[PDB]
């Protein structure tokens, strides 16, 4: 065993105490039984029971007079043998948990007579004033009816024996003579005293190391109020007991409706959320009051989720424009994504323009995906390698152009998220028809074409030299364009490309080294195209898509700003 100083939280587990000896008062049978005497006619008169001393241990808490530790009691041997145990016992409170404020207590319960067994009481302190718990060491105690305690004299000698356990500087011959000091501690049995109304007990609790004790640590995080407290109070006011739901109406219904007309991304207050909670009737009435009421409540327990999801299919179908508010990652609810997918089951041409945000949704489509991945891996563990997602898959398999758009959108997300690379294969498996797959491979050759452009951007030469080289490369590319069959156009999925005019092509003088080429389509018309590499165009691309969508929003107003998308 090793001695060392180790603080409360630093120290790990719960306390234990071994208890052994006592001091015979000799006033009774050696078990402290019945108070023996020649006057025993009175003992029959006093009905004096013969009590066999046993023990019990529980700790008085902190001297705060609360109750913490566990009462515990052992078996019975002769207490006329003076019950020498050295028996260990314990309870469930760690040293880290143990408050430096704490105190031991013990009650010796004998076994006396009819409905009779005795009781004696004592108490003491757990740790040192030096914070070491009983110095993690052996001791001896004394106790009376009340207000009594322990000292050290011969117990101070025994404490020096604990200094043998406390590892004062020691040697091997000293250890043999410490066996001779087992003979000496054997000689220590000579002790004698004859007090009354009080008793002594020899109790050793030597540990390896000296404890130390303190409070537990804590964490301050994100002279102030906080968020979770407001949650506590607000949630405390959330009772809603009597379940009867009235269907009242008044002029305040208009004001409440106006309160529900606020923007989707807004964070509602307390009273407003409750007012929207009692607005369930009108909330079901107005289609624009759906998502707002959905965000007006928080679903955690199945209690709220019950009525919520029950009213999910009950309420009027919301506008698809307002459906994009509850389709975000802000609401991860299964019933929400379900019902929204049911509302988004209809896919218009504007869904193809919404594919850009659908890629964002695809990036946000993964929540606790370990279960789904394991589910797929379960069926993937057979053959060797060589949810609204189902709706997106059906929409991808439906129209080949939409599938090409989904693949092209997956091409960008493949870099950021590694799962998208396999999700592209899952998308290829989502589309049964391979008719679009051939043109998808012909359009996959465009990656090798871009690799050829990068190969042309690999070598450094003169401006005119790189121009002529770009012309030769445009010819070599013109050979492949005629060699390979027609594919899908970058400008529009409907239009198909035929070939490209070599001499009509141009070259940018910028640092990005962009390529400008006029390609004759299947409509027998030249189409100029400017491409770039070695950079992320996702910014300007999403901005362009936003410009086109906004242009559609302007066209919806029957007025054109004449902006080129």
């Amino acid at each position: 065993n090793n001695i060392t100083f180790c603080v409360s939280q630093d120290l790990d587990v719960p306390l234990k105490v071994k208890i052994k000896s006592l001091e015979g008062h000799k006033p009774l049978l050696k078990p402290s039984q019945k108070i023996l005497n020649p006057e025993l006619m009175l003992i029959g008169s006093n009905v004096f029971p013969s009590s066999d001393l046993i023990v019990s241990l529980q700790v008085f808490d902190k001297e705060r007079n609360r109750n913490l530790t566990l009462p515990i009691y052992t078996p019975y041997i002769p207490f006329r043998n003076s019950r020498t145990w050295d028996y260990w016992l314990t309870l469930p409170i760690r040293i880290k948990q143990l408050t430096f404020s704490s105190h031991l207590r013990i009650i010796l319960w004998e076994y006396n007579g009819s409905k009779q067994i005795p009781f004696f009481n004592l108490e003491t302190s757990i740790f040192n004033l030096k914070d070491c718990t009983l110095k993690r060491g052996f001791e001896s105690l004394k106790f009376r009816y009340d207000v009594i305690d322990h000292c050290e004299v011969v117990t101070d000698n025994k404490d020096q024996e604990n200094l043998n356990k406390y590892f004062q500087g020691e040697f091997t011959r000293l250890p043999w003579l410490d066996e001779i000091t087992i003979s000496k501690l054997r000689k220590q049995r000579e002790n004698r005293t004859w007090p009354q109304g009080t008793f002594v007990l020899n109790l050793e609790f030597p540990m390896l190391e000296l404890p130390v004790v303190f409070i537990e640590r804590e964490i301050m995080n994100t002279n102030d109020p906080i968020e979770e407290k407001y949650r506590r109070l607000e949630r405390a006011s959330k009772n809603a007991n009597l379940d009867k739901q009235v269907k009242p109406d008044i002029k305040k219904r208009d004001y409440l409706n106006k309160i529900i007309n606020y923007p989707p991304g807004t964070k509602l207050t307390a009273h407003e959320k409750g007012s929207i909670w009692k607005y369930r009737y009108y909330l079901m009435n107005n289609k624009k009051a759906l998502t707002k009421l959905l965000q007006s409540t928080n679903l955690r327990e199945e209690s709220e989720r019950v009525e919520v999801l029950e009213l999910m299919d009950s309420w009027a179908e919301i506008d698809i424009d307002d459906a994009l508010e509850l389709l975000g990652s802000t609401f991860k609810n299964l019933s929400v994504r379900s019902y929204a997918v049911n509302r988004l089951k209809k896919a218009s041409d504007k869904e193809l323009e919404l594919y850009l945000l659908q890629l964002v949704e695809a990036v946000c489509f993964e929540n606790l995906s370990t279960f789904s991945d394991k589910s797929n891996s379960e069926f993937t563990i057979v053959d060797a390698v060589s949810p609204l997602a189902e709706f997106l898959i059906r929409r991808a398999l439906v129209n080949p152009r939409l599938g090409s758009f989904f693949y092209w959108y997956l091409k960008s997300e493949s870099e950021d998220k590694p799962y998208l690379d396999q999700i592209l294969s899952s998308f290829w498996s989502r589309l049964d028809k391979k008719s679009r797959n051939i043109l998808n491979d012909q359009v996959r050759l465009i990656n090798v074409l871009r690799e050829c452009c990068e190969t042309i951007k690999r070598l450094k030469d003169t401006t005119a030299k790189k121009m002529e080289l770009l012309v030769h490369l445009l010819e070599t590319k013109v050979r492949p364009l005629v060699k390979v069959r027609p594919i899908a156009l970058p400008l529009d999925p409907d239009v198909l490309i035929c070939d490209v005019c070599p001499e009509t092509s141009k070259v940018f003088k910028s640092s990005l080294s962009p390529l400008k080429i006029t390609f004759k389509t299947t409509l027998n018309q030249p189409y100029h195209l400017m491409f770039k590499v070695g950079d992320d165009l996702r910014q300007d691309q999403l901005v362009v898509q936003i410009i086109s969508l906004m242009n559609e929003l302007l066209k919806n107003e029957n007025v054109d700003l004449k902006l080129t998308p």
């Binding site: 060392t4 100083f5 180790c6 630093d10 030096k130 190391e209």
Partner: protein, 59 residues
């Protein structure tokens, strides 16, 4: 003792010799406990009564 070895796997601190001043807190009782032990036994050796010679032996 084996539990003390597990506590050694937990690895709290300790020192036999003098250690640097600990951070303020409830550990100030342990620091005062360190101040509750008599010290400078060795310091009395080099303090006064001149210098200290060395042992020179012979066959």
């Amino acid at each position: 003792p084996n539990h003390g070895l597990k506590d050694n796997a937990n690895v709290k601190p300790e020192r036999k010799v003098v250690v640097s001043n600990s951070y303020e807190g409830d550990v100030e009782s342990i620091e005062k406990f360190l101040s509750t032990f008599k010290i400078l036994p060795p310091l009395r050796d080099y303090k006064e009564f001149g210098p200290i010679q060395e042992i020179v032996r012979s066959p």
